[PDB]
Symmetry: D2
Subunit: 250 residues, 4 copies
């Protein structure tokens, strides 16, 4: 019987690339999404054409709130409902925007940035563990630049640092259950179409390895390694996939 994986924020970009690689490797997938309903269903369709009844969608807001634990529990539940098991959780969904210290209220900024980058991963990790020759693991999408943060992104950066802490704490606590918990830390990966090509090229020129951003596939390759039998002794590790960006001084 095929194993199953939940990928958060999997309608597009890096999360989709990860869901696709897992599905190709043989996983059944839960494609979680928030607003990108069309994209999520379109991916589920593609994947189901390849192999029937191997993909489902699950909509959830991962903003912090008093019902977030319920939402996270329901994401894990949807994998068990659809596939009878949940082997892998990938925490990929992430809000990202500036929150300067000097339209959204600060309450909202705190809830969205901390919720998606840290608290939801924690609550998904709880639910994944509680609901349990298998190879169970969790992969967190971290950030290679967490110690050299973008100006005015404090809440986003706090969230990513907390996700490091969770990766470590959960690796330690879930080790007795056979559940490995690791991370992948992109540098600069999929640049948005809508960026001034002046601005995209400015990020690209910063990367020592090729003067280019990582492809989604390159990030997903590291995820697939960590979930593989080739990483059976690896837990609490964060693999940077940054082309050396984080090594470059100002």
């Amino acid at each position: 019987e095929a194993p199953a994986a939940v990928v958060t924020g999997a309608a597009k970009r890096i999360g989709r690339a990860i869901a696709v690689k897992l599905h190709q490797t043989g996983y059944r997938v839960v494609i979680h999404y928030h607003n990108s309903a069309e994209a999520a269903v379109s991916l589920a369709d593609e994947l189901n054409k390849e192999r029937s009844n191997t993909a489902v969608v699950c909509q959830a807001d991962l903003t912090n709130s008093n019902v977030l634990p319920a939402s996270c529990e329901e994401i894990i539940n949807s994998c068990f409902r659809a596939f009878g098991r949940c082997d892998v959780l990938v925490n990929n969904a992430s809000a990202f925007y500036p929150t300067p210290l000097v339209g959204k209220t600060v309450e909202t900024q705190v809830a969205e940035l901390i919720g998606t980058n840290a608290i939801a991963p924690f609550l998904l990790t709880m639910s994944f563990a509680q609901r349990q020759s298998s190879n169970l693991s969790i992969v967190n999408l971290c950030d290679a630049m967490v110690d050299q943060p973008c100006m005015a992104f404090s809440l986003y950066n706090m969230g990513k640092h907390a996700l490091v802490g969770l990766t470590q704490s959960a690796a330690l606590e879930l080790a007795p259950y056979g559940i490995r918990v690791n991370g992948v830390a992109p540098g600069v990966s999929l640049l948005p179409v809508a960026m001034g090509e002046e601005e995209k090229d400015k990020w690209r020129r910063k990367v020592p390895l090729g003067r280019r951003e990582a492809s989604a596939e390159q990030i997903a390759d590291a995820v697939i390694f960590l979930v593989s039998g080739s990483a059976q002794y690896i837990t609490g590790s964060i693999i940077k996939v940054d082309g050396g960006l984080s090594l470059v001084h100002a």
Copy 2:
């Protein structure tokens, strides 16, 4: 005119030592507290008996909620209303208890642990910066053991990692205003007197330097250095005060 400082969780233990030592150095202090009202007031009395009009109290819950930004704005405002300035912020208040992955609801555990240790510090930082020759700084009480966390303390450890992120991010962002942002990271300090003799001895025996915990005053000494004119180029630094504990393998 004397500079003024806000110390959160200052009614006892390490926060009290930090308030006392700042006061001894010449600061006027706002004693923030949550439940320890009698000890907060008694400290204020003692400090005011020493120099008139140099200490006030400000009560607030720093649990995460939709009213926390206002609570944090009021803590900073209390310094201005009393003393007409606010030169130093010390983020010391902290909830600490286990939150296993497998009475409080999980949403309360998240609000308390992430609120006190990370979000409140962030909102207090926003309010402090927004209100601003001078020697302005912020000191965050971090944790020397953040990469080797206690078993079953994921949320606390998440909060403390986030606080590292805030320290770095706010140092970078506030440096143009001349506001330094640093941290002090205790190991083990002030073991609860009701913790077991076996359990205390076990922690003490692990500390390389002197096989004993730090006094509150030793933690406060590092805070004082960071706020002083002897640390005028220091920003985004976290000083461990741990007797070498974090260096000891399992």
Copy 3:
């Protein structure tokens, strides 16, 4: 045609497992060794029996001295002599023994521990670089416990820290050549066969994931990943393969 790899200290234990996996993946290998001539010759024989003239041996002391640069240059030369190319360098050889601060002279201890763990890697890196679809990379065998070092192993730990610095520096500097430079950081692996099982068990008991040391093959799996086409944007990254050991407090 087939790529070629140099593995230092490859006659036994982890280095041998690395050379065998590389070979199995289709690499031709230089098997470098120092004292273990029988094991190195025998390993080359076994691999050549599998595919004709796909392995060679090369002896060299990698102790620091005035002839170490020529020695290292000759190891890289030996790969080109045998195979006309050198795509991968794995810095695995390592002296490991205590050097207390309070029958070898201290200058010999310095020379062996810093030579094998850092200086020889740097010199090999230079010679490798100087000689250069393509997929070139270096993997350095680091140590997951470098920040929580064994008591009285200062010189070893200094060497391993130096090796981290080389991994970063060389990743930055060799990126323009498309040479990636990464590390693998074992926790406890392949405990000495001669170590009593009861001492083996003291280390084993520390490991959260499975209360077991890593196999040589598990270490080798991380090396294989890093040299593979699935790691082509990864440079300056150190992958811990430690079962959570470095996460455990004293």
Copy 4:
């Protein structure tokens, strides 16, 4: 009776500033130097004019070699011979020049960069500890930028990483003797007066806190803190004194 300190590379720049501040604090000092004889003697003269019999010079090359351990032993011995005690060691002396991977021989580059920055500190630390076999401590001058190194400075960076390892290993091992071991990590400080102005300003512009380099006295300030009675529980800590430089992404 006054305590005594050895400061290596103390004739000029940051070491000189550290020796001066230690002397103003009440220490007698050994001013170690290599080539800057006139500067060293001029400094000793000036400190002795302030307090008779409180400063000596000690010449030694700290390049790695088979006699480096005897040279390091003689430096420590010079302090006991002049003052009858040695309370503080500051490892400040440092060779700094590029060593690219692709007039000095490489043997010499290795001996100078690894000797001065790492091996001499280790040997001096041994001789220090053995002569003690009060508030005894060691301060190592580290580098805030060691994870974002200068292009083509691999050996210097390996040296400085090794020095972090020494700081940690020695703090752990010397703690039972009451000897604390810490570091101060400058970012950019005291630019060579002769460095081109455009290059000076290129570095200055990078620093968030004031867009300027640290003064030598600001670096000394943090050394003075670490040797003081206000840092009695601090060991194995490295204090960055960098104006936020290390926080800035490429």
